[PDB]
Design a protein around this ligand. Sequence first.
Ligand SMILES: Cc1ncc(C[n+]2csc(CCOP(=O)(O)OP(=O)(O)O)c2C)c(N)n1
Ligand SMILES: Cc1ncc(C[n+]2csc(CCOP(=O)(O)OP(=O)(O)O)c2C)c(N)n1
Ligand SMILES: [Ca+2]
Ligand SMILES: [Ca+2]
Lengths: 678, 678
Amino acid sequence: QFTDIDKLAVSTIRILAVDTVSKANSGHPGAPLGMAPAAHVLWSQMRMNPTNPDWINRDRFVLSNGHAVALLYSMLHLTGYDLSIEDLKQFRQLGSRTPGHPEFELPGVEVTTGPLGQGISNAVGMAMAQANLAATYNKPGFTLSDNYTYVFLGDGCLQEGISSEASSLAGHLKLGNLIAIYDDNKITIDGATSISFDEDVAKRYEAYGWEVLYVENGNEDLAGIAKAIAQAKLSKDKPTLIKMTTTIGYGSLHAGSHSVAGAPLKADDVKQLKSKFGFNPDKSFVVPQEVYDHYQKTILKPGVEANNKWNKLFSEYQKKFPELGAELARRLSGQLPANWESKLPTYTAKDSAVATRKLSETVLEDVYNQLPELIGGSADLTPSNLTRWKEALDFQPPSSGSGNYSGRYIRYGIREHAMGAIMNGISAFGANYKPYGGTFLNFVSYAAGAVRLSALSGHPVIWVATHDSIGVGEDGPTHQPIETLAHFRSLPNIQVWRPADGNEVSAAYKNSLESKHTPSIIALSRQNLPQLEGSSIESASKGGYVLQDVANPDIILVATGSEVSLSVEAAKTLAAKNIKARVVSLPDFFTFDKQPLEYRLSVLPDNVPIMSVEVLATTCWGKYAHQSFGIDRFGASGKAPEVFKFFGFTPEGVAERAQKTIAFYKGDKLISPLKKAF
Amino acid sequence: QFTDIDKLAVSTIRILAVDTVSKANSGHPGAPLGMAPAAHVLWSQMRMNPTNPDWINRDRFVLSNGHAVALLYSMLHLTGYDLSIEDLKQFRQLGSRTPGHPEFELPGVEVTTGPLGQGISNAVGMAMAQANLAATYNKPGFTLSDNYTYVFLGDGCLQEGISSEASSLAGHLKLGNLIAIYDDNKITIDGATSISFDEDVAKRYEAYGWEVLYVENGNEDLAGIAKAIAQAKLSKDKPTLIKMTTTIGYGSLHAGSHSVAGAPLKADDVKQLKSKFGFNPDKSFVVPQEVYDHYQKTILKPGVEANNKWNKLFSEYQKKFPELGAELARRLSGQLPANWESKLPTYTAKDSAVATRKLSETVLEDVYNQLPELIGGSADLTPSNLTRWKEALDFQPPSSGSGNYSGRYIRYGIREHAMGAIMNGISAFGANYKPYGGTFLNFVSYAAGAVRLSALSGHPVIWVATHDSIGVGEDGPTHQPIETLAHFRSLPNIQVWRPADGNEVSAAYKNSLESKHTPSIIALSRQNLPQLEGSSIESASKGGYVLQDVANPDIILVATGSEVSLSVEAAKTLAAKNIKARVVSLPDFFTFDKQPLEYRLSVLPDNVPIMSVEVLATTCWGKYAHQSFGIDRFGASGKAPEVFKFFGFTPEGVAERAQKTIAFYKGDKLISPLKKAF
Ligand SMILES: Cc1ncc(C[n+]2csc(CCOP(=O)(O)OP(=O)(O)O)c2C)c(N)n1
Ligand SMILES: Cc1ncc(C[n+]2csc(CCOP(=O)(O)OP(=O)(O)O)c2C)c(N)n1
Ligand SMILES: [Ca+2]
Ligand SMILES: [Ca+2]
C-alpha cells in the first residue's frame, strides 16, 4: 500500500526534473515525467545503500533510455547520494557533475548510456556476472550474492538491433533476476510509433523465452506497478519484461505530444504543472522535508543496515572458507593475484614459428587458473579464435546439461555488438571481473557502438581479434581488415595491440589485464610467424622499442605484427648492399605514446629517414614515420602468400622501398615526426 | 510435377559445389549440399534472363548466407550465365572471377555478401524500390514492375541484430513480394544451435508481421518446397519466411556434423557421395547434357522470351505516356537529368549565416522535384537532420493512411545499421535509384558494417550525417564525434565531405549525386556558420583549394568544415602582426587525392610550414600537414561556444599555434607532405 506521502514523493520527482531541464534550457522532460511513479515504486524496494554506491550485493539499476537522465539525478539526490541541488542547478553546463547523459564515473551511475540499445545489453552483462559470482562463492548459510538488475528502456532501445541480440541470449541463459521495465509511451522523435514501429513487442519477447507482464496504468497505478515487479521476482527461470503504458510528459499541457520529448517545457506550462500538483508556481527546486524524511526512512536507513549485516556475514565467511574468502576479498580490492605474470609464457629465437592466434591460446591455458576472475567467450568462432582453454565449463543454465552458472566460458552466438555491451556490463559489475570476447578483427567493426563506450567510460575489456589482415587469404576482401586498426587508433583511451611473437603476445596480455580504465584490442594472425631475436616482455610492454640496432643507421624501419619479421629479413637484404637499417617494433601506439618523450625519441630520433611497414591503411602512420609502405585499397582472394607478393610485401619489395626513401632524402636534414611545435 | 530429371539436376548441383570447394581445398560445402533442392525448385520458377542480368523486371535472388557461394556459382553456370567450369576451377584463387564470397561486380550476383545479416537487409531495400517503381510508373494496361525478391538465409543472419532491424521494418511496410527461405539446419560454428540460439524464430517473425510457412524435409521434398513458395506468393500483404529444415552436408559421411560447415570434404568422402548419387567417383566438374538442356528449356529460353515481351510493352508505354516513358528510359540508362546541376543554390559572403545542416535542407528542397529518383529518409531524426522537403509524401503501405508506396520519404525509426544496408539494396536495385539517409554523424558508426560494403561494392549511397562535432553542445561526449571522420577517411572508396559553407554544400551534393561508384558521407554542422568570401561550387568540387591567398605566405593554414572560418579570422589576427597566412579549405580528402599531383602541389607547396585545424582527431592529418591543431580526447557537456573556447579553438588561439609553428621551422628546409618517395 502506498499513501499520501508516496504521492507527494512522485510529485516531487516530476517537478524537480522539470526544474532541472528548464534551467539548462536544454534537455528532455517527457520520459522523466511519465516515469516518476514507476521509478519511485522501483527505488523504494531496491536494496541499496546511498552511503556506499560500491557495495557488491546492491540491487543494480540501469537507465537504458539515457536521455531521461533528469529522472536519474532527481532520484540520486532525493535518496541520499552525493549530488546536491547545486549540481542539479549546473545540469548540462561545462564542468558540472551533471552532464547531458549519465556518465559511468558518477556515484550511483552504473554504466554510461545515451546511445540507444546500450543500457539494456549492459544490464544483461550485470546479470551474467551476478549469476556467476553467486554460483562461485555462495555456500550453504552464506548467501553473499543475490542482487537483482533493473532496467528502464524506451522504444528506441527496443528498435536498436543490439537489444535484440542481447535479449535473445538473455532468454537462452534464463536470467531470472533481470527485470526490464519498458516505457510504453507510443512516441519517439519522428512522431508516432505506428509510423515505423507497430510490431508485437510482448510476442517477440516471449519467443526469446522471457516472461511479459503488463501494467496498463503506468501514470498512477502504484499498486499494480509494485505488483508487476513482485510477480516478476517469482519467476527465477525467465527474465521478465514489464510493458508499462504511460503518457510522455504527463502533467503538461502537451502531454502525449512529441514536443515534450526532447525539449524544455514552456515556463507557462511549468507553472500550471506545479499549481496542478499542488506546489507554488513561483519557486524552483523545492523538495518537501517530508519527502527527505521518507527516503531516509524507507531506503537509506534500511539499505545502510542491509550493508552492515552483509559485511559481517562476509567476515564469518572468511573464517569458514579461508581460500575462497581471501580470493573474494582480493577481487573486491581490485588487485590481481601476486606475481601472477610469472606464469606468462616466454620464448627464444630457437622456438617454433607459430601464429600469434595460437600463442594467444597458450597464454589463456597458462593463466586461467591463476585468475578466477577471467571469464571469456567467443561469438561463434571458438574453433578459429582459439579462445577456449581445455578444462573449461560453459556458463549455461543448470538445466542445459551443457554447463552451469559457475562456468567461465560464454557462447555469445553471432552477436558481436551485444558481446561488446555485455562484456562492458560484466566489467562494470565489479569484483575484478576480466571479460574477453573473440571474433574476427574485421567484425569487431560491427561492435563500434559499444567499443566506443568501453573507452569513453574506461571499462578494461579485452577483444581477442584474430585474422588481422590479408593473411586471411581465400576468404577475400569481405573478411580482410584494411581500415580497422587505423579507426581504433583514432579513438581515445583504447590500446590496439598487434604483437609480433610469443613474447610480444605476453606483453599484450600483461598490460591488457593489469589495466583498470583502458580497454584493449589484440589483433592476432591466422598465419604462422617466427620467434624474433630481440623481443621480450619487458621491452614490448613499452609499446614500441628497438628490435635490432646498428651504429649510425641509414634508415629506420618501423613495423608491427606480421611485418616485423619481414622487415628483419628486409634488413638482411639491405646489409648485403651496405645499408644499415635499424628495426623498431611498435606493438601499440597507445602504450608507446604513454612513455616519456626521452624514451620515444631514443626510439624515433632526428637525422634519419623513418619508413613504416604494415599491410593495412597508411592514414595513421604520419605520427611516427616519414614515408609509409602499406595498403590503401581493399584486399583480394587467393592463397595468402600469393596475395602478399601481389601487394609488394616481400623482403626485396620492402628493401627496394627503403632504398628509394634513402635516395629521396640524401642531403635533407630530417626531424623525428614525434616532434610537435605546440 | 518433379521428375527424375529434377532429381538428376539436384545431384549435379551438390556434386558441382563439392568439386568446386575441394579443388580450392578451401570453402563451405555444408549449406550448398543442404540447399541444392531449394535452389533447384526456386530458380526453376524464377523469371530471369541469364543473357541480360540487368533486365529491370527480373526476379531477384540474394544469398545472405554468403559463405555458401559454390551454390550460387553452380547455379550461375548451369542456368546459362556468363561463368564457366574453368572459372569454377579457379574458385578462391587470386585474380579469378570466382572469389570466396559473392561480389557485386559479377553478373548474376545481386550484391556483395559474406558478413552476416547484410544480404537479408539488402533484399528489403530491393523490395521497397520495387514497390516504389511499380507505384510510380505502372499504369492500367502496363504492369512494368512486379518482380519478387527471393532470399536464402541461415541461423547466422538471424542472430545478427541488423536482420532484426530490417525484418522489423519489412513487416511494417508489408513487403509482400519479399520471400525468405531459412536454412534451418540446427548447427553453427561452435556447435548445436541449442548451445546459444534456441528462441522461437517463427513466433518472433509473426510478431513482426511476417507470415511463416514450414517445409520439414528440405533434404528431399521438392514438392513441399514448391507449395511453400506458391503459398508465399499468395500473401501480397505480408513478407513470408519459410522455415525449411535441412541437414548440413547432406550426402556426406558427416552430414549433420559441423565439420562439414566451413571445411572441404575428404577425397574418400567425396567419392561415396558421387557413387551414392549415381555419378562416377573418379571424375570432376561433370554436368550431364540433360541438365544443361533442362535449364535451357525451363529457364533461359522462357526468360529471354519474357524480357522480349517486356521490351515491346515498354515501347508502347513510351508511346502512350511520353513524359513518364521518357523519364524511366533515362533512369534505366543511368543518366541524371540534363543540366540538373543548374538548380543547385549558390551564395556570397554577404548572405546570412546558416548552419551547414540547414543549407543541406535547402538543396533537398531545390533538387527533389528535379530528380524523381531521389528517395530519402532519416533514422528517427527528421526534425534534427532536416532531411525532408515540404511537399514530401512518405513511403508506406496504402492502408496506413499516412502515405503510400510511391512516396519518397522513408521513416526508418532507430535503425542505423539496417538503413545503410537497405540503402545498399535500393541503390543495388537499379533505375538510377539515388537513396540517402540521415542520422547524427556519431551514430553512422553504429552502421559501419553496411558502410564498409557500400565502399567495397561501390554503391553511391548518401549519408546526411549531421551534428558533426562538439558544436553539438550539452548532449555531451556520448554524442560528439572525435574519431568518426578519421575512421571513414581510412576506408577506401568513400567520400567524406565536410562542407564549410553554402557553396561547399552544393559542391558536396553535386559530386555525391554525380557519383556512380563511390558512396558518401556529408558531415553537416548543428550551429550557424558565415558564408566565406572565396568559396565556390567549382573550386570545392576539387575537394581542396586555396580559399585565401597571399604573396609569400609565412604559413599555410588548412582547415575543414566550421574551422575554415575560424582559420580565416585567425589569419586576420596574424596579419596585424605582419605574418602572412594562406588559408586552404579541404572539403574532402577523397576528391582531393583524385586531382592531378601538380594541382595538389599548387595547393600544398614546398617551403612553407603547414598547420591543419579541425575539432576532431588529428591522426589522419599527417598526409597533408606538418603540425595539426585538433582534439584527440573525448568531448564535453556544455554550451557549444564554451566547449570550443575550452579546447582552444578561438581566433587568437589558432594564431598563437601558427606562430609557434613558424618559430619551430624557422631556418629549416620544408618538404610538402604530398611528396612520396616510392
Ligand atoms: C544509437 C542512437 N541512435 C539514435 C539516437 C538519437 N535519439 C535520441 S532519443 C531518440 C528516440 C526516442 O527514443 P525513445 O526511447 O523512444 O524515447 P522517449 O519517448 O523515452 O523519450 C533518438 C532518435 C541515439 N540517442 N542513440
Ligand atoms: C558479421 C559476421 N560475423 C561472423 C562471421 C563468421 N561466420 C561465418 S559462418 C558463421 C557461422 C555459420 O552461420 P550459419 O548461418 O549458421 O551457417 P551454416 O553453417 O548453417 O551454413 C559465422 C560466425 C561472418 N562471416 N560475418
Ligand atoms: Ca517513446
Ligand atoms: Ca546453420
